[PDB]
Each structure stands twice: as structure tokens, then as C-alpha cells.
Amino acid sequence: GKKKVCYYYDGDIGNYYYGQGHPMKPHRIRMTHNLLLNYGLYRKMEIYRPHKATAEEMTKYHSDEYIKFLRSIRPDNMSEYSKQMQRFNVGEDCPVFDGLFEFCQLSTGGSVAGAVKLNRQQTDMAVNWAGGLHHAKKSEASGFCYVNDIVLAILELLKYHQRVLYIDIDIHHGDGVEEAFYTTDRVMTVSFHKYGEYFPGTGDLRDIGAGKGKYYAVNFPMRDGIDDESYGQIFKPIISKVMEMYQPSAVVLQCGADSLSGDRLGCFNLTVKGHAKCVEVVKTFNLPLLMLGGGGYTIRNVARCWTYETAVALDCEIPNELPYNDYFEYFGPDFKLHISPSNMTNQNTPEYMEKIKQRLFENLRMLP
Ligand SMILES: CCC(O)(O)CCCCC[C@H](NC(=O)[C@H]1CC12CCN(C)CC2)c1nc(-c2ccc3c(c2)[C@H]2CC[C@@H]3C2)c[nH]1
Ligand SMILES: [Ca+2]
Ligand SMILES: [Ca+2]
Ligand SMILES: [Zn+2]
């Protein structure tokens, strides 16, 4: 039936600024929060302010030298760290900005706190829209991500769950999470992403894991223009087969909204309903679930998407007419919650979708 939902948010998160021209805008998290507050979604959720994750909590995965660097670097002392900046890939995509470490602490704190709440059986679902920073590596920042809150949250869930399923619907391949668990069978990673002349360049359908992790990494490479019909046609059958074969006891779902139509960096054509159908599919399995944010660069659509996915988690119907809110003008000219797909061509033919699904089904037959 209806599930208990715990939501993590710090009111300071929207003030972190990556810099002029940078597509990553933490302000979209504040827009999401304000929109869901104005729809009355706080009446049914337990809202928590995450703690600031310590350097020590982050080193359960990341190297001590990398976390020490993140805790020390600032725009005013950058000149003295040119060597470490190159070593840790801090530069254009992952810039040094005021409060960088505190931003990482809040993003991570929400994910780890949600995982602890799930481990204690005190909630059915935990939501952290500030998390889902899937590209960060053990000793390297990557693709706007510095600390991999997902890996840290999964490590927390592994304290009480033998098998954890990670599902990533961001348009970009979830490389940092896949790499962290590539040689283990205790985590199965499933990523649906655009593949071909696109960041980060990984996630080929032939990348299936290694050693004890062979067959525990699943990648569904897609081309431009995927729509609700095509995505829905493969998501439920793949996830149903993964649930059947792997039998996870907890799930983490990365809900990156850059797979929506009209995204500044993405080239997919999903609507908010099509994207949210993934949340509905996962929720139906009735397993402890951690829902996280991720990409999303047309910020009015990210706020619409995550507001609707929070309503989905709560089993609460909300009207298409947007309520008045602090950012009302950002939702013009329509002031509606749902979006329309564009006229872009879907390069993923129905035959391509079925063929890739069949190759993934062959790999899933190899599980014990
Ligand atoms: C949160 C999860 C997630 O998955 O959604 C994260 C997605 C990350 C996409 C990263 C991608 N980077 C790249 O494609 C890497 C090969 C480069 C090209 C761009 N230059 C600056 C660095 C080297 C990329 N970077 C940009 C980008 C656009 C505009 C700018 C920048 C990056 C910086 C330099 C100018 C401004 C700031 C676009 N695409
Ligand atoms: Ca993905
Ligand atoms: Ca794995
Ligand atoms: Zn992305």
C-alpha cells in the first residue's frame, strides 16, 4: 500500500554556486523544495535536515589525500594547489567554488542519513534530491561531482543488506558507481544512458563486470531522441528480470532529470510522466528504496520532475495547474507541471530497443 517517505533537505543548498556559465545549478534543489511545499506535499512526508558528512565518513570510499584536498582548497588559495588540482581533476567541469566542501557534506549527508533510516526500518522510502552525484571516483572529481554520495550510501546499506540494486536513469552513464562495485556481486548496477560521442564515454553494453562481479553490471546504451513509449517498453521488462534473478533486499534509484525533453545538456525526449514511470515501476517491488537526484540542466523541468516523483513516492495525486510559488515566473508561459515532448526524431528504432534488451536478457540468464 502507501509507504512512509522521509525527505532530506538543507535550506542552504540552493546558495552554492558553480560559477558563471556552469550548467550545474544547486538552486534547482531549492526550486524543487518550494514547488513541493506549495503543492502541500510536506503534509504526508517526514522532512529532515541532513547532518554535514564528516571527512571521515567520506573516506569510507574516497582516499584520505583526496578528501583532505577538498577540505582545504578555496578560490583564495587555488594558486598554491595547481599540482593537486590536476591530479584530482578539479578545473573546468569540477571548479573550485566558495563552500565546495560544505556542498559535498550536505549532498552526502542526505544520502547517508537516508540509508541509515532505511537500515533501521524506520521508513520505506528516503529521498535526497541533492545527491546522485554518480561520476565521482575514489581519488578524482568528475562531471560536476566531487564526492560520490551514492557509493557511500550503498556502503551504508551493505551493513544490513546482502544484495543492493542500483538503477540509474540519468542520461549520462553512472561510471563512478559502476567502477566502485565492478568486481563484487553484493551490488548490481543498472544504467540506461546515451552512448556514443557523449560523456563520460563508458557504459558499452559489453561492459558487464569482472571477477566476482561478472554479470553484475548492466548497461543499456541508447541513441538521441528516446521517448516515453520506447523507454517504458524496455525499463519494466529489464527491471522485472533483474528483480527476479538478483533478488535485492534494498534499491537505490538515481533520478537524473537530464534525460527529459528540452534539457540543456541532454538529447533525450522523455516527459515528466515517462521519467516518473521508472519510479512507479521500482516502487511496485515493495523494497526499501533510496531515491536520489543527479543531472538536470533546464531547471524549471528539473523542479517539475522531482516534485512529481516525490508525489509518486507518496501516492499523492497533484494537479497539473502549478500552485503559486517563489519561482512562479520560471514556469511560464504555461505554468503547468507536465511537459510536452519535442518533434525530435527517435534514433532508437523499436528493433534496436528489442535487440539490446535481448542481449541484456542473455547476460541476466548467467546469474546463479
Ligand atoms: C550530475 C550528473 C551528470 O551526469 O548529469 C553530470 C554530467 C557531466 C557532463 C560533463 C561534460 N564534460 C565533458 O564533456 C568533458 C570532456 C570535457 C568537455 C568540456 N570541458 C569543459 C572539459 C572536458 C560536460 N561539461 C559541460 C560544460 C558546459 C559548460 C561549461 C563547462 C562544462 C565548464 C567550462 C565552461 C562552462 C563551465 C557540458 N558537458
Ligand atoms: Ca544512467
Ligand atoms: Ca557490480
Ligand atoms: Zn547527467
User: What's phi and psi for 63, nearest 5 deg?
Assistant: -70, 150
Asked if 267 contacts 291 with a C-beta cutoff of 8 angstroms, the reply is no
Query: Which residue, by CA, sits nearest to atom 34 of ligand 1?
Result: 92
Q: Report how far Cα 191 is from the mean position of its chain's Cα atoms.
A: 11
Was 163 annotated as part of a binding site? no
Asked if 254 contacts 167 with a C-beta cutoff of 8 angstroms, the reply is yes
| Residue of 17, 92, 173 best suited for mutating to test ligand 1, as the one with most atoms within 8 Å of CB | 92
Closest CA to 275 of 337, 328, 327, 205: 337
- Ligand number nearest CA of 174 is 2
Question: 240 vs 86, 233, 285, 347, CA distance in Å?
Answer: 43, 12, 9, 25
- Experimental approach taken: X-ray
Query: Which residue, by CA, sits nearest to atom 2 of ligand 1?
Result: 295
CA of 255 to the centre of ligand 2 (A): 9
Q: Say how many CA atoms lie within 13 Å of 312 toward its Cβ.
A: 23
- Ligand number nearest CA of 192 is 2
Query: Is any atom of ligand 1 closer than 6 Å to the C-beta of 293?
Result: no
List the domain range (segments joined by +) for residue 180. 1-368
- Ligand number nearest CA of 219 is 2
Query: Which residue, by CA, sits nearest to atom 16 of ligand 1?
Result: 199
Was 168 annotated as part of a binding site? yes
Closest CA to 34 of 22, 47, 16: 47
Query: Is any atom of ligand 1 closer than 6 Å to the C-beta of 368?
Result: no
Query: Is any atom of ligand 1 closer than 6 Å to the C-beta of 12?
Result: no
Residue 22 appears among annotated catalytic residues: no
Was 64 annotated as part of a binding site? no
Q: Which three cell numbers stand for residue 23?
A: 550548467
Asked if 231 contacts 203 with a C-beta cutoff of 8 angstroms, the reply is no
Was 187 annotated as part of a binding site? yes
Neighbours of ion ligand 3 (CB under 5 A): 181, 187, 213, 216-217
Write down the catalytic residue from 135, 161, 193, 275. 135
Sign for the pseudo-dihedral over CA of 297, 303, 308, 309: positive
Report the chain's C-alpha Rg in angstroms. 19
Resolution (A): 1.7
| Residue of 85, 93, 170 best suited for mutating to test ligand 1, as the one with most atoms within 8 Å of CB | 93
User: In DSSP terms, which residues pair with 6 in a beta bridge?
Assistant: 46, 126
What is the total count of domains within the chain? 1
Q: Report how far Cα 94 is from the mean position of its chain's Cα atoms.
A: 17
CA of 203 to the centre of ligand 2 (A): 9
